[PDB]
Amino acid sequence: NHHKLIILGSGPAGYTAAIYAARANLKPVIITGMQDTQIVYDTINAVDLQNKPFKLVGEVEQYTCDTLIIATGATAKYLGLESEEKFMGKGVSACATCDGFFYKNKDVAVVGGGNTAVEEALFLSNIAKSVTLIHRRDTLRSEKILIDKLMEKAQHGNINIIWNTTLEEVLGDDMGVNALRIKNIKTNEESQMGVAGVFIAIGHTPNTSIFAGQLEMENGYIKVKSGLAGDATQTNIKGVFAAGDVADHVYKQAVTSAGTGCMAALDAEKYLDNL
């Protein structure tokens, strides 16, 4: 179906872009990966931005639009273990805010040491019985205020931190994951702990492979005009805008993504007015 404006993503950028687009009565459509404003649950696997209108190819439906706001965020990197692929959506996940509610009063683990890992551990503490953060280094690379919150819960709450350790194998059966094999990288001593689910939070790349060859990109990030003269979210293709983490490899905060999401909606409004 055809729409004046389609927004890809539902993080702070996508959501803020929809609010502003809706306030301008553009009747935006948000297409978000399965897991006024109209919300469509679909996953775009291909796009054609060389002609007007722009074409988006979903699982079964095809969409067309006059303007496109890309706010797909980032997607988790995986360790690459066979037991990781093998237990996907069955004890292995890379999105605590997606699947974390299924582990109420259960023991879970988080693998990583950046902001994503710390934020996921903190988010899972309010749901899980216990949260075990596993990281290969001796220190964490996150904001100080979040580290202090984490350490407070590690000393007096339901969080355990295992330093200088890597995930060797995810163990489980037909019903799902039930254990993890870990190894201390400094001592090479292996252990085995019981876990109902593990959350991989080790690194994030922008979700932009489908735009390869059509949009100017650098290290996977969609290039935007930026600047102080307006049209700051516009890509090399007029009418195609990018906001949030897909076009920001420095700040990566919900508030900065919300800001560019707003900008994208206003940029799109101006493009539609002059069509």
Q: How far is CA 137 from CA 111, 153, 166, 181, in A?
A: 11, 20, 9, 17
Task: Name the percent of the chain in helix, strand, coil, to the closest 5.
Answer: 25, 30, 40
Q: Which residues pair with 6 in a beta bridge?
A: 29, 68
Q: What residue 19 binds from Cl ion, a second copy, none (CB within 5 to 8 A, per partner kind)?
A: a second copy
Residues 2-21 that bind a second copy (CB under 8 A): 10-12, 14-16, 18-20
**Cis before residue 53, ω within 30 degrees of 0?**
yes
Q: Which of 99, 173, 231, 267 is catalytic?
A: 99
Q: Which of residues 76-95 bind Cl ion (CB under 5 A)?
A: 85, 89, 93
Which listed option, Cl ion, a second copy, none, makes contact with residue 58 (CB within 5 to 8 Å by class)?
Answer: Cl ion
**From the candidates 36, 65, 95, 245, which is the catalytic residue?**
95
203 binds Cl ion (CB under 5 A): no
Calpha distance 211→115 (Å, rounded):
27
Residues 25-44 that bind a second copy (CB under 8 A): 25, 30, 32, 34-37, 39, 43
Residue 42: contacted member of Cl ion, a second copy, none (CB under 5 to 8 Å, by partner type): Cl ion
Note if 99 is an active site residue.
yes
185 close to 164: Cβ distance less than 8 angstroms: yes
Min dist. Cβ of residue 269 to a second copy (A): 9
Nearest to 213 by CA among 65, 71, 54, 48: 48
Beta bridge partners of 57: 46, 62
Strand intervals (E) in 49-98: 54-57, 62-70, 74-76, 92-93
Binding pattern to a second copy, positions 54-83, x when CB under 8 A? -----x---------------xxxxxx---
Do 112 and 132 touch, CB atoms closer than 8 A? no
Interface positions, 93-152, toward a second copy (CB under 8 A): 93-95, 97-99, 101, 104-105, 122-123, 126, 141, 143-146, 148-149, 152
Is 65 an annotated catalytic residue? no
What x-and-dash track marks residues 200-239 binding a second copy by CB under 8 A?
---------x--------x--x-xx-xxxxx-x-------
Of 36, 51, 60, 274, which lies in the binding site for Cl ion, with binding defined by CB under 5 A? 60
The yes-or-no answer on residue 95 being catalytic is yes
- The partner in contact with residue 103, picked from Cl ion, a second copy, none with C-beta cut-offs of 5 to 8 angstroms by kind, is none
171 and 82 Cβ atoms separated by less than 8 Å: no
Q: Which of residues 155-174 bind a second copy (CB under 8 A)?
A: none
Binder of residue 11, out of Cl ion, a second copy, none (CB less than 5 to 8 A by kind): a second copy
| Segment (H or E) for 218 | strand 217-218
Instruction: Please give the span between the terminal C-alpha atoms of the chain, in angstroms, as a whole number.
Output: 20
Count Cα atoms within 13 angstroms, Cβ side, for 141: 10
Q: Would you tell me which residues interact with Cl ion (CB under 5 A)?
A: 9-10, 32-33, 42, 58-61, 85, 89, 93, 99
